[PDB]
Design a protein around this ligand. Structure first.
Ligand SMILES: [Zn+2]
Lengths: 86, 49, 144, 82, 148, 144
């Protein structure tokens, strides 16, 4: 008995994964080649992906690397109001 | 007269970029439309001035 | 053969596809590539985009009005945006000034007529006025 | 798909509602008899939904249609591929 | 004792037929809102390009039109009505063109609005008007136009 | 019939009513409605009001001088302010361009000649040059 429902987006950012190694990028060099890795989603080279930050330039070389798999990490909070009768 | 004494020039109109921060009211440091300046621009129009 | 290019010949077909609303890719000379589009809704007018990459959650195209000239369309090459291939990895592009030697050991200039390859990746080239195929080494890229 | 999820109950209360008009109670008098009504579902007068309170004082009027209101707030994340 | 009906210059709406005619090389006439009426043409020969002329009359032995290269815009064609130069002419600048809703006084002293379906002319060059639902052809003075 | 309109024909009657001091309502084209009045006292001159609603304890009309033109009165429609009806709930207003089909299945345009209704609220419409009545569905509102 969902009386009302609402959704909120807290974060929306891109995170990259190596196809074979299964790790997530955390650091890059001056040439923008990967230097480090982590197996933790909470610590990754996050690229903002909100409305204002689309069409970036910082990570063009990183994107074109075929070994990397971009992922849209999105965090949400949803409020649900229940009326359960008496 | 104007076409005679003028010089060929590209006229591009100005308009505030959507990238402006809704709360502070000041622009993003870098975006494709405007390079830090808070004002973007339309395609140019060839003109004599 | 290679399926990396499918240029449109008639401007009438271009206008027909624009009426259908499909995006186009329009090359330029020593300049960035362009995408062209017909605006939706009540008012119909051309729109252009300086961006080229495919739309995605992390990348969105920007469209603005522009008084596109039919001269550009009729003259410059045009492709369907969805079916365009970024690059064919060959030393020489199509329609490029090249130099070679004829069958009688006489040197001659020409432009590339066709770009071909075998199943093993070896690339063969056919020049204007020459039915036979030429090796990549046998050709020479003429300087402008 | 879901990578991580957790559910918590922010509030759990009992809302009072009229049987004829259908409007919930907003403000009340000294004895807590109704003086104002409201169409809102959240702003309506409410009390903690636990047995101790119920035993500690339905009591105001014969319009006997209370409504157990429970608020679910959920935190979750997704990793949507390309 | 009259002259047969005269066709109105049909405006062309579809861009596709406009481009097809242009590719065929048939002349087009564009009614620009701001700066008058101009002709549009495709250059003959291999060096294809659009040309414009303001020599705004039918071609004649004593009056040959001069064509200047111009970068005609698609939007210009779309937003501006375009006509075939073989049709658009001074011959009949009728006050009430075909398909126009006009107000006409009926014999019962009751004003009615009808759409002109057919127009013709006579020896004196008058404009006989045919209205739907009636056989008798009205004259210029009797009719009236209602705008907006 | 419906009693929602009682337009005045002669300007002489309009002036006679103005001498009596009764307020008038004067329509406009794509513009707000106007009320007109004759000033009291020693000096006689026309006055106008942009307000329309009835006077009350919570609403009072505002009057100012204006050089009203007889052309407006003679041309535009005029009513008595007290007896005017705000709206008649019909799809099509009176004197509006409409389209229909004749008895021989021929399409024709016309303007509405009369607006009528039965006791059950069903609305019938009579067009110029057509004595018979037409259903609301049978009519078509022509676009300007
Ligand atoms: Zn910006």
């Amino acid at each position: 008995s969902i009386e009302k429902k609402e959704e909120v987006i807290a974060h929306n950012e891109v995170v990259f994964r190596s196809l074979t190694q299964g790790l997530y990028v955390k650091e890059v060099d001056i040439y923008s080649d990967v230097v480090s890795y982590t197996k933790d989603v909470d610590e990754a080279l996050a690229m903002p992906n909100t409305i204002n930050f689309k069409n970036s330039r910082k990570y063009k070389k990183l994107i074109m690397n075929l070994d990397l798999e971009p992922l849209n990490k999105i965090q949400k909070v949803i409020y649900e109001t229940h009326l359960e009768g008496l | 007269f104007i076409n005679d004494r003028g010089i060929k020039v590209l006229w591009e109109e100005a308009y505030f970029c959507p990238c402006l921060n809704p709360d502070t009211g000041h622009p993003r440091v870098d975006c494709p439309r405007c390079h830090g300046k808070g004002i973007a621009y339309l395609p140019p129009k060839e003109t004599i001035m | 053969p290679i399926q990396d290019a499918k240029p449109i010949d008639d401007i009438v077909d271009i206008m027909t596809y624009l009426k259908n609303g499909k995006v186009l890719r329009v090359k330029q000379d020593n300049q960035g590539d362009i995408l062209v589009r017909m605006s939706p809704g009540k008012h119909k007018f051309t729109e252009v985009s300086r961006d080229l990459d495919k739309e995605s959650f992390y990348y969105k195209r920007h469209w603005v009005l522009y008084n596109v000239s039919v001269n550009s369309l009729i003259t410059f090459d045009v492709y369907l945006d969805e079916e365009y291939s970024e690059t064919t990895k060959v030393k020489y592009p199509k329609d490029t000034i090249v130099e070679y030697t004829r069958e009688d050991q006489e040197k001659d200039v020409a432009m590339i007529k066709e770009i071909l390859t075998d199943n093993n990746g070896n690339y063969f080239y056919a020049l204007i006025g020459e039915t036979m195929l030429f090796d990549e080494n046998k050709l020479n890229k003429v300087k402008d």
